[PDB]
JSON list of C-alpha atoms in Angstrom, two decimals:
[
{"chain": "A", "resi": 1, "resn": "UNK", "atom": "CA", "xyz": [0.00, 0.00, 0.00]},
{"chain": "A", "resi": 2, "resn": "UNK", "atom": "CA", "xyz": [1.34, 3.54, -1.24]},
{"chain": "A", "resi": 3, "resn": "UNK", "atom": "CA", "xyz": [-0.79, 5.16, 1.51]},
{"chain": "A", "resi": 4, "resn": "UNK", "atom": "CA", "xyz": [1.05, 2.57, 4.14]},
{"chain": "A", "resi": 5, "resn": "UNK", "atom": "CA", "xyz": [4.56, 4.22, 2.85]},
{"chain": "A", "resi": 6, "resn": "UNK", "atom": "CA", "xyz": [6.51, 5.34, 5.68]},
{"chain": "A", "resi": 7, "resn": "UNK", "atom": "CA", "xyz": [7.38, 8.59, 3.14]},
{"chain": "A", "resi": 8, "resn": "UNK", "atom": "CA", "xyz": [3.86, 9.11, 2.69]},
{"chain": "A", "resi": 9, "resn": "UNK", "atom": "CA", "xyz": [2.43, 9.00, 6.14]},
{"chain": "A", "resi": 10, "resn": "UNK", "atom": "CA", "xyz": [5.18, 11.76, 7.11]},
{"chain": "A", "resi": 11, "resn": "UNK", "atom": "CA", "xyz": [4.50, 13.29, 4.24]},
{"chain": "A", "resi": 12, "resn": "UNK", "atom": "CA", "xyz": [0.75, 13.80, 5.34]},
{"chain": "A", "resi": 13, "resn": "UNK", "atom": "CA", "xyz": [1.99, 14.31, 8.66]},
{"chain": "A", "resi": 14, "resn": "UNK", "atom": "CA", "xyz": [4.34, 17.22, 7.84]},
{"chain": "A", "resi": 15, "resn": "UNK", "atom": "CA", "xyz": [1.20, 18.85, 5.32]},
{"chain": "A", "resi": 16, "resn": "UNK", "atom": "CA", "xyz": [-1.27, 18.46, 8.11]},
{"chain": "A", "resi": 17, "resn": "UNK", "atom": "CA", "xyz": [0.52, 19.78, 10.70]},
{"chain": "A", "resi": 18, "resn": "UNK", "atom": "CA", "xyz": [1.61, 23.04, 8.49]},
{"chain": "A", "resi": 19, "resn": "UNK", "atom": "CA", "xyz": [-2.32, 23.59, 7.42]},
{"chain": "A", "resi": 20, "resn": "UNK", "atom": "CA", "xyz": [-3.05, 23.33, 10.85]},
{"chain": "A", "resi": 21, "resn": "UNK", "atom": "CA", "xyz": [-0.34, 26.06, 11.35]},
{"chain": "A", "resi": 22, "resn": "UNK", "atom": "CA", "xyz": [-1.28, 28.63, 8.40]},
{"chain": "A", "resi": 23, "resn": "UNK", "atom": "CA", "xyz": [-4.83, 28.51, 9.57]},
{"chain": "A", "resi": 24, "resn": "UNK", "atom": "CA", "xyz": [-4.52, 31.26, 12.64]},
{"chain": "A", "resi": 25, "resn": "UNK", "atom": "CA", "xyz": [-0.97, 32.37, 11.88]},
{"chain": "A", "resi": 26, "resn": "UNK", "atom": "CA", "xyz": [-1.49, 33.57, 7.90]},
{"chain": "A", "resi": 27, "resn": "UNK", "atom": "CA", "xyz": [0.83, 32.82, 5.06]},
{"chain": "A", "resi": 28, "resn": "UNK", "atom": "CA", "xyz": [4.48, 32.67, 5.22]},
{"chain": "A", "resi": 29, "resn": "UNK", "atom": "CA", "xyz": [3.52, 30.25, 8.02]},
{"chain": "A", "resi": 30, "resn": "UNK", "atom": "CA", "xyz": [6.20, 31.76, 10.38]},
{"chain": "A", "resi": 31, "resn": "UNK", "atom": "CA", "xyz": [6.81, 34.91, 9.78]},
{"chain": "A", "resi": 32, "resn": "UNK", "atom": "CA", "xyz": [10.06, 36.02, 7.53]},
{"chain": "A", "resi": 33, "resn": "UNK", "atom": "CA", "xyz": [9.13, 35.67, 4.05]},
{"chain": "A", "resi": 34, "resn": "UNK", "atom": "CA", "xyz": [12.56, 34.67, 2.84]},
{"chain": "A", "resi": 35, "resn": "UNK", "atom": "CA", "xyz": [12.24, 31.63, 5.41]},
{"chain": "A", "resi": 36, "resn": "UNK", "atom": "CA", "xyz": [8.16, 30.59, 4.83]},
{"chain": "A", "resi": 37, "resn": "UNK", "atom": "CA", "xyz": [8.04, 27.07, 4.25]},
{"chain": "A", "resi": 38, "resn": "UNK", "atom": "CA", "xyz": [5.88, 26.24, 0.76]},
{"chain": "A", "resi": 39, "resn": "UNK", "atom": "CA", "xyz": [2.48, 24.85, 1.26]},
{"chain": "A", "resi": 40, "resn": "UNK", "atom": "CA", "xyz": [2.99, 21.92, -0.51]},
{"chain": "A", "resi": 41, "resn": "UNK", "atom": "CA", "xyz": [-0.70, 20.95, -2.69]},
{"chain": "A", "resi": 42, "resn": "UNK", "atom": "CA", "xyz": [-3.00, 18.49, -0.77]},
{"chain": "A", "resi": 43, "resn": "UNK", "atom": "CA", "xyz": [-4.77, 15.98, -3.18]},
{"chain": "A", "resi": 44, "resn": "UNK", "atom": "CA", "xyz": [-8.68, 15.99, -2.55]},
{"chain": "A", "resi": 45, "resn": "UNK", "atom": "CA", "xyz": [-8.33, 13.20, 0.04]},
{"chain": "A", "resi": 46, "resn": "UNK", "atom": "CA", "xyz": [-5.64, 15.02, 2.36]},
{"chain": "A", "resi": 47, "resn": "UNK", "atom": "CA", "xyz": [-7.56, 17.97, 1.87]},
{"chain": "A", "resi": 48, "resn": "UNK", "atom": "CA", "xyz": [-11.09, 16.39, 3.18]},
{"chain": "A", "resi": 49, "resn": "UNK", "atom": "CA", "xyz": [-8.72, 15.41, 5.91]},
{"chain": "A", "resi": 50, "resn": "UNK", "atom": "CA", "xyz": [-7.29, 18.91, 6.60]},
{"chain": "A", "resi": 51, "resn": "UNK", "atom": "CA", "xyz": [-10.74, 20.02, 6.21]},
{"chain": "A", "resi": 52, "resn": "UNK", "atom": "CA", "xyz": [-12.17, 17.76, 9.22]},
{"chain": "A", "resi": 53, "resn": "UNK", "atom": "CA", "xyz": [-9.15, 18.35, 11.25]},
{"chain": "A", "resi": 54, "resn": "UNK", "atom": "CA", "xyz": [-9.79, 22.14, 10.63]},
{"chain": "A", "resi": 55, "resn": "UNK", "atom": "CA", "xyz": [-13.38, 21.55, 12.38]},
{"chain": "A", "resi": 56, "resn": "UNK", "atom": "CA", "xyz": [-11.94, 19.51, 15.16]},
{"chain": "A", "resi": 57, "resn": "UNK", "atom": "CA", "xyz": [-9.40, 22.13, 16.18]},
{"chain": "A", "resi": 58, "resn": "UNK", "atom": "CA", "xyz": [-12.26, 24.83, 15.71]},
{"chain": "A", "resi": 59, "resn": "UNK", "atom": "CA", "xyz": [-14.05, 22.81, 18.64]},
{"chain": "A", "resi": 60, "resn": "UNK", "atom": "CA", "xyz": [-10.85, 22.61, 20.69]},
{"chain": "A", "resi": 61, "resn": "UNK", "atom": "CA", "xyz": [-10.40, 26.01, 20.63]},
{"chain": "A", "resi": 62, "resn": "UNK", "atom": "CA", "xyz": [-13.57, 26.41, 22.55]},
{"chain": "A", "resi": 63, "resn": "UNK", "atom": "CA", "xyz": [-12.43, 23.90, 25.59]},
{"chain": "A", "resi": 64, "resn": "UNK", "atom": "CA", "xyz": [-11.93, 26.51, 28.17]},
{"chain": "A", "resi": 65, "resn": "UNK", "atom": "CA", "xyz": [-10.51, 24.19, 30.33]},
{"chain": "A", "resi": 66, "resn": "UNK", "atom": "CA", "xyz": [-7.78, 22.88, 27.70]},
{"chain": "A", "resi": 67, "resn": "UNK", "atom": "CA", "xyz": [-7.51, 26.75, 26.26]},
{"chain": "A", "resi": 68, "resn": "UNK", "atom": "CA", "xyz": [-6.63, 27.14, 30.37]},
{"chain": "A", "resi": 69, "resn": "UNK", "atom": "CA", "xyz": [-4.03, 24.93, 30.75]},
{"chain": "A", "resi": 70, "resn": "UNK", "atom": "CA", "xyz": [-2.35, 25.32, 26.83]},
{"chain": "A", "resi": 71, "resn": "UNK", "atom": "CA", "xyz": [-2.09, 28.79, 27.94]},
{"chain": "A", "resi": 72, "resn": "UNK", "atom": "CA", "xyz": [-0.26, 27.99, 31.04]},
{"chain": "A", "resi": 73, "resn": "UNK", "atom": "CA", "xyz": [2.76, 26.08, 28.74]},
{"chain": "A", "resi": 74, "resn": "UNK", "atom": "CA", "xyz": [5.81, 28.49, 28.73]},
{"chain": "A", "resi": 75, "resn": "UNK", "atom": "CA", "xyz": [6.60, 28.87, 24.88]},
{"chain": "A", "resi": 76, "resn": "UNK", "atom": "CA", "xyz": [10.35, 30.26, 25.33]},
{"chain": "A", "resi": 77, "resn": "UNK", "atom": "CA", "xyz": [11.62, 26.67, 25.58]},
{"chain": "A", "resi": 78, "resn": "UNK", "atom": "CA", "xyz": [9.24, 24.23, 24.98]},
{"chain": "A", "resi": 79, "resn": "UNK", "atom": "CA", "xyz": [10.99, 21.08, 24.67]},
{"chain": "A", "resi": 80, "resn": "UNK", "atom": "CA", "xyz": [10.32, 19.67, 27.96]},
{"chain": "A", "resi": 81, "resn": "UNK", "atom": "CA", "xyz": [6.85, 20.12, 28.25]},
{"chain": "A", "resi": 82, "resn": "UNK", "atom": "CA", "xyz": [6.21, 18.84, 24.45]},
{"chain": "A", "resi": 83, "resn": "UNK", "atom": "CA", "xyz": [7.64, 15.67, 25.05]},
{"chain": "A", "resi": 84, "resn": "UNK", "atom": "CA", "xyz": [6.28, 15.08, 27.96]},
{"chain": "A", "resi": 85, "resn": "UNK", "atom": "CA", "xyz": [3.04, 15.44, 27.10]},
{"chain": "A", "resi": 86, "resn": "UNK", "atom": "CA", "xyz": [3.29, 13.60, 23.47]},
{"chain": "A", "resi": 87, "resn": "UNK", "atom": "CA", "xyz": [4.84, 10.59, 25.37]},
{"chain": "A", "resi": 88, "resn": "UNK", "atom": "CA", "xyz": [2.54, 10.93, 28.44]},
{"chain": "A", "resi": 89, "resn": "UNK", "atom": "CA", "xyz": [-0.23, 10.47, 26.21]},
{"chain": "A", "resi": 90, "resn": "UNK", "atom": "CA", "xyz": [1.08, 7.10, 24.77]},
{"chain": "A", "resi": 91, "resn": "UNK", "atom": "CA", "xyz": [2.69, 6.13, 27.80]},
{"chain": "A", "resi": 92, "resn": "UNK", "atom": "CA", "xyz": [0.44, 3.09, 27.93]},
{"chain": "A", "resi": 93, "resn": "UNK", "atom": "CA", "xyz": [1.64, 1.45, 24.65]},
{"chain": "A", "resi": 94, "resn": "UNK", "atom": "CA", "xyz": [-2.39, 1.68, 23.12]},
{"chain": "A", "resi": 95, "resn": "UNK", "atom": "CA", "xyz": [-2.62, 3.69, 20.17]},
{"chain": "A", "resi": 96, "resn": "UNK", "atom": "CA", "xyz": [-6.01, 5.88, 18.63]},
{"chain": "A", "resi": 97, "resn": "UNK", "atom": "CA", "xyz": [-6.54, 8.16, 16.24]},
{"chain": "A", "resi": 98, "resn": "UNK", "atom": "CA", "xyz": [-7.88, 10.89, 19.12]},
{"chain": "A", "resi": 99, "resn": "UNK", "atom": "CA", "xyz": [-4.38, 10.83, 20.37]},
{"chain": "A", "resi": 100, "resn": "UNK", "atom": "CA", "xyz": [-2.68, 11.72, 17.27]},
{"chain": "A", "resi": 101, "resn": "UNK", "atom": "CA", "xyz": [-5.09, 14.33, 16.70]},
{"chain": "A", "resi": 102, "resn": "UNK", "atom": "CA", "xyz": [-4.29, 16.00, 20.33]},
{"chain": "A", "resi": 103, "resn": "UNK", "atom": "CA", "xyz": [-0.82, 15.68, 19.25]},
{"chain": "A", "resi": 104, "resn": "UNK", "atom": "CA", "xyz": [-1.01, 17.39, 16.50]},
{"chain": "A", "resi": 105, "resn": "UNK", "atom": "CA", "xyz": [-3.78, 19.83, 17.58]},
{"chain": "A", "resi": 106, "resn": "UNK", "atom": "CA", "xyz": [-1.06, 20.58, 20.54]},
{"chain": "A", "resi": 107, "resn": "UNK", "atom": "CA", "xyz": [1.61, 21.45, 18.20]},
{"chain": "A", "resi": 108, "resn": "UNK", "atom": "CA", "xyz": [-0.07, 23.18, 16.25]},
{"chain": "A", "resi": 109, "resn": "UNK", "atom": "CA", "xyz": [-1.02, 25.48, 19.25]},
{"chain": "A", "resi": 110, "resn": "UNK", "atom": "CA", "xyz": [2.67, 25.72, 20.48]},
{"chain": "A", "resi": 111, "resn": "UNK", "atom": "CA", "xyz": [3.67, 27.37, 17.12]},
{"chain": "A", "resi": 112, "resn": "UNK", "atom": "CA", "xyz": [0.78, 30.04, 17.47]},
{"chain": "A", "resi": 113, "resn": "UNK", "atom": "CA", "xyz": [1.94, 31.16, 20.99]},
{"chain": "A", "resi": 114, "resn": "UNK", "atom": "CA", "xyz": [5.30, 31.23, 19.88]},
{"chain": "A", "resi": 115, "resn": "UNK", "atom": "CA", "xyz": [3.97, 33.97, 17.23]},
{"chain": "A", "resi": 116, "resn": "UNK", "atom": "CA", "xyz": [4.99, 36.39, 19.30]},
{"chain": "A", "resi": 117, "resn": "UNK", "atom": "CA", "xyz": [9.49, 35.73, 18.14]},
{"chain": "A", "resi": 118, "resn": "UNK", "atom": "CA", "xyz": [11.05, 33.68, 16.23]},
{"chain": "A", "resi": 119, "resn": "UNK", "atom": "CA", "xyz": [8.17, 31.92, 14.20]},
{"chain": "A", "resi": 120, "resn": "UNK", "atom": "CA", "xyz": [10.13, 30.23, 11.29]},
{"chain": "A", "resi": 121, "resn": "UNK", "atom": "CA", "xyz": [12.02, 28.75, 13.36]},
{"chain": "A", "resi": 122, "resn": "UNK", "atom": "CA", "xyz": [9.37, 27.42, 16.46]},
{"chain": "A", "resi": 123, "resn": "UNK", "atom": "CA", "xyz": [7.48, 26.71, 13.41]},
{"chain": "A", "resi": 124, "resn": "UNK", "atom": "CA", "xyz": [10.09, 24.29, 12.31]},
{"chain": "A", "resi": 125, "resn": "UNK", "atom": "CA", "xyz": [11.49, 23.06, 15.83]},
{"chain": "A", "resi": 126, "resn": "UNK", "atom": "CA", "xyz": [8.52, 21.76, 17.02]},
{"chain": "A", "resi": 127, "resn": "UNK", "atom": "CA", "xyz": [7.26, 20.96, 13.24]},
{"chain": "A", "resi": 128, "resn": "UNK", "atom": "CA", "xyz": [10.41, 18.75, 13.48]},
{"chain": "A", "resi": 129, "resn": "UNK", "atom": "CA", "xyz": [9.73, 17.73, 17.28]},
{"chain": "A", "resi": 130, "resn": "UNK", "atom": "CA", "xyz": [6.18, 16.38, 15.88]},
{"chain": "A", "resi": 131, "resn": "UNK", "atom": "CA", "xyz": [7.44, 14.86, 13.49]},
{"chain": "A", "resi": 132, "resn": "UNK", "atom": "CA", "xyz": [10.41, 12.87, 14.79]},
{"chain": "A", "resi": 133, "resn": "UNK", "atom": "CA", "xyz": [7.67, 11.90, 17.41]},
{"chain": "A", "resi": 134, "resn": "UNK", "atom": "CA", "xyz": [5.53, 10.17, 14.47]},
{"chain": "A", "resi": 135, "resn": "UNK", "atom": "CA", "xyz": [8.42, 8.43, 12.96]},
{"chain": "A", "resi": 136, "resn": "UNK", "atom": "CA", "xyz": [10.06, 7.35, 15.99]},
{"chain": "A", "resi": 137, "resn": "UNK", "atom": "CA", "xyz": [6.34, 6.57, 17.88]},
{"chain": "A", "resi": 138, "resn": "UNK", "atom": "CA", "xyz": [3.73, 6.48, 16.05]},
{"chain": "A", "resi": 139, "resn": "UNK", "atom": "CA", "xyz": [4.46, 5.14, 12.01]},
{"chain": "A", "resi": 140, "resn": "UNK", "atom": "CA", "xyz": [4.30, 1.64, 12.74]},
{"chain": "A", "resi": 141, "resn": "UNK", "atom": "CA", "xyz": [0.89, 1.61, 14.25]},
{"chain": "A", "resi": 142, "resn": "UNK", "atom": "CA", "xyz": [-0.49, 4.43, 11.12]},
{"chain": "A", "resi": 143, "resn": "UNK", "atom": "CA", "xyz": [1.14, 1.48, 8.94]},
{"chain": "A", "resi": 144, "resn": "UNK", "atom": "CA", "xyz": [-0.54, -1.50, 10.33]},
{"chain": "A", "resi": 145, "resn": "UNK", "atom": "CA", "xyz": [-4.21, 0.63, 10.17]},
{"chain": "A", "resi": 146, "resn": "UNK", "atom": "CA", "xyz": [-3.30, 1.30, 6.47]},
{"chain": "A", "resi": 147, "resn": "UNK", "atom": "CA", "xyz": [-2.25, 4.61, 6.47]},
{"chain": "A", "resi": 148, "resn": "UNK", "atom": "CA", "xyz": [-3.99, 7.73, 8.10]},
{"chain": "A", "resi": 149, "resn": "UNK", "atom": "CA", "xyz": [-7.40, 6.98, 5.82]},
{"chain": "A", "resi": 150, "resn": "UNK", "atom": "CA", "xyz": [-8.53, 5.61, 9.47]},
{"chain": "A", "resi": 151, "resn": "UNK", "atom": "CA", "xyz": [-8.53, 9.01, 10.53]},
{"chain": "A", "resi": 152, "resn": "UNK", "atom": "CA", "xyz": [-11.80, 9.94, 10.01]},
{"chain": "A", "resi": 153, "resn": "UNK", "atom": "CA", "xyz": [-13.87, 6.73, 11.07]},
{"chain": "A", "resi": 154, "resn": "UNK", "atom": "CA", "xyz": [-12.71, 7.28, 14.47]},
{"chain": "A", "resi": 155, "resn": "UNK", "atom": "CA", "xyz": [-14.83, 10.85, 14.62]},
{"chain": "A", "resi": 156, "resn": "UNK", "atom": "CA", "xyz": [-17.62, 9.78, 12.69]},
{"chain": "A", "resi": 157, "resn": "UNK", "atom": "CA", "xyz": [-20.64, 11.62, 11.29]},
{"chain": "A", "resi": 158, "resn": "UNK", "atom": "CA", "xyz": [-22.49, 13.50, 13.24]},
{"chain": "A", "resi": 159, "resn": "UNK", "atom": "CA", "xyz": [-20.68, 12.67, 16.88]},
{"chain": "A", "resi": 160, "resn": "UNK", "atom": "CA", "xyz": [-17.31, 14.03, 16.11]},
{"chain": "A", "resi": 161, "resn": "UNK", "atom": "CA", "xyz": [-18.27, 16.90, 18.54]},
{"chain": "A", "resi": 162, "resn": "UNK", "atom": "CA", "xyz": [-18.89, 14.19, 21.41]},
{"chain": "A", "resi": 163, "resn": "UNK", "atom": "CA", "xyz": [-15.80, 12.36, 20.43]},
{"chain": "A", "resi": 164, "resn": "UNK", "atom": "CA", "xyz": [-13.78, 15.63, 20.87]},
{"chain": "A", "resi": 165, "resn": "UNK", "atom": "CA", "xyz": [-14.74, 15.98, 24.67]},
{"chain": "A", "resi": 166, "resn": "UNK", "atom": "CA", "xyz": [-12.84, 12.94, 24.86]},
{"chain": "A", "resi": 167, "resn": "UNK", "atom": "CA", "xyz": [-9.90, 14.23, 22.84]},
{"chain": "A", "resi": 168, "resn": "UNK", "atom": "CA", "xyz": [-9.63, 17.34, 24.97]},
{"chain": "A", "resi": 169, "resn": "UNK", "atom": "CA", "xyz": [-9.66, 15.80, 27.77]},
{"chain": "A", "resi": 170, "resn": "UNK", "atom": "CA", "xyz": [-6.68, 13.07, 27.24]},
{"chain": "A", "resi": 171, "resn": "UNK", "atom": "CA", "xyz": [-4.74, 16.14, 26.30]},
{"chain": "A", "resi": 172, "resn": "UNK", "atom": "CA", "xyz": [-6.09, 18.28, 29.40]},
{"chain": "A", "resi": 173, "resn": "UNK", "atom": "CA", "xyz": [-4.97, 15.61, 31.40]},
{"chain": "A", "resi": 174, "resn": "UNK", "atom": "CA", "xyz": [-1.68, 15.22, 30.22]},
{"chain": "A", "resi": 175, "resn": "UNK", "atom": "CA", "xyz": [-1.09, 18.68, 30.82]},
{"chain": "A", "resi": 176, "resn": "UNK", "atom": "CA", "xyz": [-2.21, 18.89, 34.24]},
{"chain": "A", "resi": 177, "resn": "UNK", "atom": "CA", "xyz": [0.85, 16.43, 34.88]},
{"chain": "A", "resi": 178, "resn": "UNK", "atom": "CA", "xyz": [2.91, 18.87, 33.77]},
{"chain": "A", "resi": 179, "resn": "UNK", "atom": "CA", "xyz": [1.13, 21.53, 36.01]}
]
């Protein structure tokens, strides 16, 4: 399966995470036009994907509980508290497509506070953190579901807003560790 190509899945990885990035924070994705990392073209299936991710943040961003506590994450040096949380969330070797979402939902959210300096590069650290985090953590499981098609099923029509109180709260959680 092309779709079960470890160069595709990061390759879908890498183009969801940056539409989830030039959604709040405009073109140039970062800032310095010299350094803005292309938007490389979706295909109409990544972009139905991008599309119902696009939703699914939209809800997060309501959480005011989750809003609380990504607020609370220093954004000078976020290393520590990005790993921590991606690998809390795994931490019990079980794998679902909520997860993966929070992770990249997270991310996505780091770069944005991190607006305020240095947004090329955040934009690629923790682009890179994520990521290294899917090759190293997560590929093998995306490859064994058959690629990141499985995506959507685990939303569903019409209760992907109840399956998102579920998805803000494993990333809540995690979070409040880190508290």
């Amino acid at each position: 399966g092309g779709p079960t190509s470890s160069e595709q899945i990061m390759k879908t990885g890498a183009l969801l995470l940056q539409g989830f990035i030039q959604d709040r924070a405009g073109r140039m994705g970062g800032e310095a036009p010299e350094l803005a990392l292309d938007p490389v073209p979706q295909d109409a299936s990544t972009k139905k994907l991008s599309e119902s991710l696009k939703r699914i943040g939209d809800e997060l961003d309501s959480n005011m509980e989750l809003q609380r506590m990504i607020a609370a994450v220093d954004t000078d040096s976020p290393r520590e508290v990005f790993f921590r949380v991606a690998a809390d969330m795994f931490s019990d070797g079980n794998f679902n497509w909520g997860r993966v979402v929070a992770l990249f939902y997270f991310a996505s959210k780091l770069v944005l506070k991190a607006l305020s300096t240095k947004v090329p590069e955040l934009i690629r650290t923790i682009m890179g953190w994520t990521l290294d985090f899917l090759r190293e953590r997560l590929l093998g499981w995306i490859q064994d579901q058959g690629g990141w098609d499985g995506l959507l099923s685990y939303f569903g029509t019409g209760t992907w807003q109840t399956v998102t109180i579920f998805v803000a709260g494993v990333l809540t959680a995690s979070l409040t560790i880190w508290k």
